[PDB]
């Protein structure tokens, strides 16, 4: 019914250049790979996330999937505990989510 998630943002400014996009996507994809191979996601957020909750491991707590931005909710369809989703692009950059738990 509800999911517990954490988030990481690899930032991009408005109207980013190709060089900026390629760098951010590369870093985001590498973080996804690390997270899918056992790296502590909260510590990856502490080290790399630009979002305001980075120091708290990007924790989002528990919630209902459809209340999140559609780009997140859609990507979380049928996701299982431990899944890493992303990179997901939006105007602010590349997003990565970890499904910490489900209940």
């Amino acid at each position: 019914t509800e999911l517990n998630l954490s988030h990481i943002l690899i930032p991009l400014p408005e109207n980013p250049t190709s060089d900026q996009v390629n760098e951010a996507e590369s870093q985001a994809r590498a973080i996804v790979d690390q997270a899918r191979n056992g790296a502590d996601f909260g510590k990856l957020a502490i080290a790399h996330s630009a979002d305001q909750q980075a120091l708290n491991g990007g924790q989002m707590g528990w919630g209902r999937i459809q209340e999140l931005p559609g780009i997140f909710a859609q990507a979380l369809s049928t996701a299982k505990k431990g899944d890493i989703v992303g990179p997901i692009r939006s105007g602010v950059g590349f997003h990565i989510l970890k499904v910490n738990d489900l209940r």
Partner: peptide, 7 residues
């Protein structure tokens, strides 16, 4: 949700 990032 306790926190929802901006997109």
């Amino acid at each position: 949700w306790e926190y929802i990032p901006n997109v």
